[PDB]
């Protein structure tokens, strides 16, 4: 059981050591499309690339590339798209991807500015009466409503395909309180946020995969998917304690590199799953 594994690693202070064994066992697949010179300005970080085998392709004939991966968790029956925070020049590609994949929810785990630098373009409208038009991808985005809470904001958005005049409702879940440095002290508000996303229907198989991002789409984004998948597997299995976080994380690392960026994020992920299991058992 992971609670006792947690005390062992914590009492022995072995988090950096566990973390390094995960780094050393992690998959390495080619990322040739990401490294093409025509794609250099579609990547926020030169060391964070989608693998070719799992990358999302845009349906535009010119250049199909976006920095985004499909993470398919076969046993849990959950998919996720993990992507970077959009750049000024990729906001239109981001919303094209949401449209094409039939996503219902976007999960944002960063602020637009952190540590005095921009982590993400402002890719949604701030006021009802000032909609955004993405001329490169022929989409319109309107803010319908905004519900601001202590730890997160939920926004209803309308996305309109200007080519076909179809509209969809998109839910934006914005976790606003992750600290600039380190991880939250308690996983309580993070779990509350994860249960709100679940309650919306955004993670359900009647929609396309949820889009999840932070700045790079690997660190905080990784913690979100890992916690969700581990708690779902504990509901599904005859023996909930057969669930090994380390194995789930390595299975997820087959689809996108670098998920869980620090030993502190690994410790936080254990704490989130351990605490979430109390609300589920």
CSV table of C-alpha atoms in Angstrom, one decimal:
chain,number,residue,atom,x,y,z
A,1,UNK,CA,0.0,0.0,0.0
A,2,UNK,CA,1.2,3.5,-1.1
A,3,UNK,CA,0.5,5.2,2.3
A,4,UNK,CA,3.2,3.1,3.9
A,5,UNK,CA,5.5,3.4,0.8
A,6,UNK,CA,4.9,7.3,1.4
A,7,UNK,CA,6.0,7.1,5.0
A,8,UNK,CA,9.1,5.0,4.1
A,9,UNK,CA,10.3,7.4,1.3
A,10,UNK,CA,9.4,10.4,3.5
A,11,UNK,CA,11.1,9.1,6.8
A,12,UNK,CA,14.2,8.0,4.7
A,13,UNK,CA,14.1,11.3,2.6
A,14,UNK,CA,14.4,9.2,-0.7
A,15,UNK,CA,12.2,11.4,-3.0
A,16,UNK,CA,15.1,12.6,-5.2
A,17,UNK,CA,16.2,8.9,-5.5
A,18,UNK,CA,12.7,7.5,-6.5
A,19,UNK,CA,12.4,10.4,-8.9
A,20,UNK,CA,15.8,9.6,-10.6
A,21,UNK,CA,14.9,5.9,-11.1
A,22,UNK,CA,11.6,7.1,-12.9
A,23,UNK,CA,13.8,9.5,-15.1
A,24,UNK,CA,16.1,6.5,-15.9
A,25,UNK,CA,13.3,4.0,-16.7
A,26,UNK,CA,11.2,6.5,-18.8
A,27,UNK,CA,10.6,5.9,-22.5
A,28,UNK,CA,12.4,7.7,-25.3
A,29,UNK,CA,10.7,7.9,-28.7
A,30,UNK,CA,11.5,10.0,-31.7
A,31,UNK,CA,10.1,13.6,-31.9
A,32,UNK,CA,11.2,14.4,-35.5
A,33,UNK,CA,8.2,16.5,-36.5
A,34,UNK,CA,8.7,18.8,-33.4
A,35,UNK,CA,12.4,19.5,-34.4
A,36,UNK,CA,11.7,20.5,-38.1
A,37,UNK,CA,12.9,24.1,-38.6
A,38,UNK,CA,9.4,25.3,-39.8
A,39,UNK,CA,8.1,24.3,-36.3
A,40,UNK,CA,10.6,26.1,-34.2
A,41,UNK,CA,8.3,29.0,-33.4
A,42,UNK,CA,5.4,26.5,-32.5
A,43,UNK,CA,7.4,25.3,-29.4
A,44,UNK,CA,7.6,27.3,-26.2
A,45,UNK,CA,10.6,25.2,-24.8
A,46,UNK,CA,13.2,23.6,-27.1
A,47,UNK,CA,13.6,20.6,-24.6
A,48,UNK,CA,9.8,19.8,-24.5
A,49,UNK,CA,8.5,18.0,-27.6
A,50,UNK,CA,5.7,15.6,-28.3
A,51,UNK,CA,6.7,12.2,-29.5
A,52,UNK,CA,5.7,11.6,-33.1
A,53,UNK,CA,3.7,8.4,-32.3
A,54,UNK,CA,1.2,10.2,-29.9
A,55,UNK,CA,1.3,13.8,-31.2
A,56,UNK,CA,-2.1,15.6,-32.1
A,57,UNK,CA,-2.3,16.5,-35.7
A,58,UNK,CA,-4.2,19.6,-36.9
A,59,UNK,CA,-6.5,19.0,-39.9
A,60,UNK,CA,-4.9,22.0,-41.9
A,61,UNK,CA,-3.0,20.8,-45.1
A,62,UNK,CA,-0.2,23.4,-44.8
A,63,UNK,CA,1.4,22.5,-41.4
A,64,UNK,CA,-0.4,19.9,-39.1
A,65,UNK,CA,2.0,20.6,-36.1
A,66,UNK,CA,1.0,21.6,-32.5
A,67,UNK,CA,2.9,20.8,-29.3
A,68,UNK,CA,0.3,18.5,-27.9
A,69,UNK,CA,0.1,14.7,-27.0
A,70,UNK,CA,-2.7,12.2,-26.6
A,71,UNK,CA,-2.3,10.2,-23.4
A,72,UNK,CA,-4.5,7.1,-23.7
A,73,UNK,CA,-5.0,5.2,-20.4
A,74,UNK,CA,-6.6,1.9,-21.7
A,75,UNK,CA,-7.4,0.2,-18.4
A,76,UNK,CA,-8.9,3.5,-16.8
A,77,UNK,CA,-10.8,4.3,-20.1
A,78,UNK,CA,-9.5,7.9,-19.8
A,79,UNK,CA,-7.8,10.0,-22.5
A,80,UNK,CA,-6.2,13.5,-22.1
A,81,UNK,CA,-4.5,15.9,-24.5
A,82,UNK,CA,-1.5,17.5,-22.7
A,83,UNK,CA,-0.3,20.7,-24.4
A,84,UNK,CA,1.9,23.7,-23.7
A,85,UNK,CA,0.4,27.1,-22.8
A,86,UNK,CA,-0.3,28.6,-26.2
A,87,UNK,CA,2.0,31.2,-27.8
A,88,UNK,CA,0.9,34.5,-29.3
A,89,UNK,CA,1.2,32.8,-32.8
A,90,UNK,CA,-0.5,29.4,-31.8
A,91,UNK,CA,-3.7,30.6,-30.1
A,92,UNK,CA,-5.6,29.9,-33.3
A,93,UNK,CA,-4.1,26.4,-33.6
A,94,UNK,CA,-5.0,25.7,-29.9
A,95,UNK,CA,-8.7,26.4,-30.5
A,96,UNK,CA,-8.6,24.5,-33.9
A,97,UNK,CA,-7.4,21.5,-31.9
A,98,UNK,CA,-10.2,21.9,-29.3
A,99,UNK,CA,-12.7,22.0,-32.2
A,100,UNK,CA,-11.2,19.1,-34.2
A,101,UNK,CA,-10.9,16.8,-31.1
A,102,UNK,CA,-14.5,17.5,-29.8
A,103,UNK,CA,-13.1,18.5,-26.4
A,104,UNK,CA,-15.7,19.8,-23.8
A,105,UNK,CA,-13.2,21.1,-21.2
A,106,UNK,CA,-9.9,23.0,-21.0
A,107,UNK,CA,-8.0,22.7,-17.8
A,108,UNK,CA,-5.4,25.5,-17.1
A,109,UNK,CA,-3.1,25.0,-14.1
A,110,UNK,CA,-1.0,28.2,-14.4
A,111,UNK,CA,-1.5,32.0,-14.3
A,112,UNK,CA,-0.7,34.0,-17.4
A,113,UNK,CA,2.1,35.7,-15.5
A,114,UNK,CA,4.2,33.9,-12.9
A,115,UNK,CA,7.6,35.0,-11.5
A,116,UNK,CA,7.3,38.2,-13.5
A,117,UNK,CA,7.3,36.5,-17.0
A,118,UNK,CA,4.5,35.5,-19.3
A,119,UNK,CA,3.9,31.7,-19.1
A,120,UNK,CA,1.0,31.7,-21.6
A,121,UNK,CA,-0.8,34.0,-24.1
A,122,UNK,CA,-4.2,35.4,-23.0
A,123,UNK,CA,-6.1,33.0,-25.3
A,124,UNK,CA,-9.7,33.6,-24.0
A,125,UNK,CA,-11.9,36.8,-23.8
A,126,UNK,CA,-11.9,38.8,-20.6
A,127,UNK,CA,-15.4,40.4,-21.2
A,128,UNK,CA,-18.7,39.2,-22.6
A,129,UNK,CA,-19.0,42.0,-25.1
A,130,UNK,CA,-15.4,41.7,-26.5
A,131,UNK,CA,-15.2,38.3,-28.4
A,132,UNK,CA,-12.0,37.0,-30.0
A,133,UNK,CA,-11.8,36.1,-33.7
A,134,UNK,CA,-8.9,33.8,-34.8
A,135,UNK,CA,-8.6,34.7,-38.5
A,136,UNK,CA,-5.9,32.0,-39.3
A,137,UNK,CA,-8.3,29.2,-38.2
A,138,UNK,CA,-11.8,30.8,-38.8
A,139,UNK,CA,-13.1,30.5,-35.2
A,140,UNK,CA,-14.9,32.9,-32.9
A,141,UNK,CA,-14.7,32.6,-29.1
A,142,UNK,CA,-17.2,34.4,-26.7
A,143,UNK,CA,-17.1,34.5,-23.0
A,144,UNK,CA,-20.7,33.5,-21.8
A,145,UNK,CA,-20.2,33.5,-18.0
A,146,UNK,CA,-17.4,33.4,-15.4
A,147,UNK,CA,-17.7,32.0,-11.9
A,148,UNK,CA,-14.7,33.2,-9.7
A,149,UNK,CA,-14.0,31.2,-6.6
A,150,UNK,CA,-11.2,31.3,-4.0
A,151,UNK,CA,-8.9,28.6,-5.6
A,152,UNK,CA,-10.3,28.4,-9.2
A,153,UNK,CA,-12.4,30.1,-11.9
A,154,UNK,CA,-14.8,28.3,-14.2
A,155,UNK,CA,-15.8,29.9,-17.5
A,156,UNK,CA,-18.4,29.0,-20.0
A,157,UNK,CA,-17.2,29.8,-23.5
A,158,UNK,CA,-18.9,29.6,-26.9
A,159,UNK,CA,-16.7,28.4,-29.7
A,160,UNK,CA,-18.1,29.1,-33.2
A,161,UNK,CA,-16.8,27.5,-36.4
A,162,UNK,CA,-17.2,30.5,-38.8
A,163,UNK,CA,-16.9,28.2,-41.8
A,164,UNK,CA,-20.0,26.0,-40.8
A,165,UNK,CA,-21.7,28.3,-38.2
A,166,UNK,CA,-21.8,25.3,-35.8
A,167,UNK,CA,-21.3,26.4,-32.1
A,168,UNK,CA,-20.2,24.4,-29.1
A,169,UNK,CA,-20.0,25.2,-25.4
A,170,UNK,CA,-16.5,24.8,-23.9
A,171,UNK,CA,-15.9,24.8,-20.1
A,172,UNK,CA,-12.6,26.5,-19.0
A,173,UNK,CA,-11.4,25.3,-15.6
A,174,UNK,CA,-8.6,27.6,-14.3
A,175,UNK,CA,-6.8,26.6,-11.2
A,176,UNK,CA,-5.5,30.0,-10.0
A,177,UNK,CA,-3.6,29.3,-6.7
A,178,UNK,CA,-0.7,26.9,-7.6
A,179,UNK,CA,2.2,28.8,-6.0
A,180,UNK,CA,5.0,30.4,-8.1
A,181,UNK,CA,7.5,28.1,-6.3
A,182,UNK,CA,7.1,24.5,-5.1
A,183,UNK,CA,3.7,22.7,-4.7
A,184,UNK,CA,0.6,23.4,-2.5
A,185,UNK,CA,1.0,22.5,1.2
A,186,UNK,CA,-2.3,20.6,1.2
A,187,UNK,CA,-3.9,18.7,-1.8
A,188,UNK,CA,-7.4,19.6,-0.6
A,189,UNK,CA,-8.1,22.5,-3.0
A,190,UNK,CA,-6.5,20.6,-6.0
A,191,UNK,CA,-8.8,17.5,-5.3
A,192,UNK,CA,-11.8,19.8,-5.0
A,193,UNK,CA,-10.9,21.2,-8.4
A,194,UNK,CA,-10.3,17.7,-9.9
A,195,UNK,CA,-13.8,16.6,-8.6
A,196,UNK,CA,-15.4,19.8,-10.2
A,197,UNK,CA,-13.8,18.9,-13.6
A,198,UNK,CA,-15.2,15.3,-13.3
A,199,UNK,CA,-18.7,16.6,-12.2
A,200,UNK,CA,-18.9,18.7,-15.4
A,201,UNK,CA,-18.7,15.7,-17.7
A,202,UNK,CA,-15.5,17.0,-19.4
A,203,UNK,CA,-13.6,13.8,-18.6
A,204,UNK,CA,-16.4,11.5,-19.8
A,205,UNK,CA,-16.2,9.2,-22.9
A,206,UNK,CA,-19.2,10.9,-24.6
A,207,UNK,CA,-16.8,13.9,-25.4
A,208,UNK,CA,-13.4,14.2,-26.9
A,209,UNK,CA,-10.4,14.3,-24.6
A,210,UNK,CA,-10.0,17.1,-22.1
A,211,UNK,CA,-7.2,19.6,-23.0
A,212,UNK,CA,-4.8,20.1,-20.0
A,213,UNK,CA,-2.0,22.6,-19.9
A,214,UNK,CA,0.3,24.5,-17.7
A,215,UNK,CA,3.3,26.4,-19.2
A,216,UNK,CA,5.2,23.3,-20.6
A,217,UNK,CA,2.3,20.8,-20.3
A,218,UNK,CA,4.4,18.2,-18.3
A,219,UNK,CA,4.7,19.3,-14.6
A,220,UNK,CA,1.4,20.5,-13.0
A,221,UNK,CA,-0.4,19.0,-16.1
A,222,UNK,CA,1.2,15.6,-15.3
A,223,UNK,CA,0.0,15.8,-11.6
A,224,UNK,CA,-3.6,16.4,-12.7
A,225,UNK,CA,-3.8,13.3,-15.1
A,226,UNK,CA,-1.8,11.1,-12.8
A,227,UNK,CA,-4.1,11.8,-9.8
A,228,UNK,CA,-7.3,11.4,-11.9
A,229,UNK,CA,-6.2,8.0,-13.5
A,230,UNK,CA,-4.9,6.5,-10.2
A,231,UNK,CA,-8.2,7.3,-8.3
A,232,UNK,CA,-10.3,5.9,-11.2
A,233,UNK,CA,-8.2,2.6,-11.2
A,234,UNK,CA,-8.7,2.3,-7.4
A,235,UNK,CA,-12.5,2.4,-8.1
A,236,UNK,CA,-12.3,-0.1,-10.9
A,237,UNK,CA,-10.0,-2.8,-9.4
A,238,UNK,CA,-10.9,-5.7,-7.0
A,239,UNK,CA,-7.9,-4.7,-4.9
A,240,UNK,CA,-7.4,-0.9,-4.8
A,241,UNK,CA,-3.8,-1.3,-3.3
A,242,UNK,CA,-2.6,-3.0,-6.5
A,243,UNK,CA,-2.4,0.5,-7.9
A,244,UNK,CA,1.3,1.5,-8.2
A,245,UNK,CA,1.7,5.3,-8.9
A,246,UNK,CA,5.2,4.8,-10.3
A,247,UNK,CA,3.9,2.3,-12.8
A,248,UNK,CA,1.0,4.5,-13.9
A,249,UNK,CA,3.4,7.4,-14.3
A,250,UNK,CA,5.8,5.3,-16.5
A,251,UNK,CA,2.8,4.2,-18.6
A,252,UNK,CA,1.8,7.9,-19.1
A,253,UNK,CA,5.5,8.8,-19.9
A,254,UNK,CA,5.2,6.5,-23.0
A,255,UNK,CA,2.9,9.2,-24.5
A,256,UNK,CA,4.6,12.5,-23.4
A,257,UNK,CA,8.0,13.1,-22.0
A,258,UNK,CA,8.8,14.6,-18.7
A,259,UNK,CA,5.4,14.3,-16.9
A,260,UNK,CA,6.1,15.3,-13.3
A,261,UNK,CA,9.0,17.7,-13.4
A,262,UNK,CA,10.4,17.6,-9.8
A,263,UNK,CA,10.6,15.2,-6.7
A,264,UNK,CA,8.3,17.6,-4.9
A,265,UNK,CA,5.6,17.2,-7.7
A,266,UNK,CA,6.0,13.4,-7.3
A,267,UNK,CA,5.5,13.6,-3.5
A,268,UNK,CA,2.5,15.9,-4.0
A,269,UNK,CA,1.0,13.4,-6.5
A,270,UNK,CA,1.2,10.6,-3.9
A,271,UNK,CA,-0.4,12.9,-1.2
A,272,UNK,CA,-3.2,13.8,-3.6
A,273,UNK,CA,-4.0,10.2,-4.5
A,274,UNK,CA,-3.7,9.1,-0.8
A,275,UNK,CA,-6.0,11.9,0.4
A,276,UNK,CA,-8.4,11.5,-2.6
A,277,UNK,CA,-8.7,7.7,-1.8
A,278,UNK,CA,-10.2,8.6,1.7
A,279,UNK,CA,-13.1,10.5,-0.1
A,280,UNK,CA,-13.5,7.4,-2.4
A,281,UNK,CA,-13.2,4.6,0.3
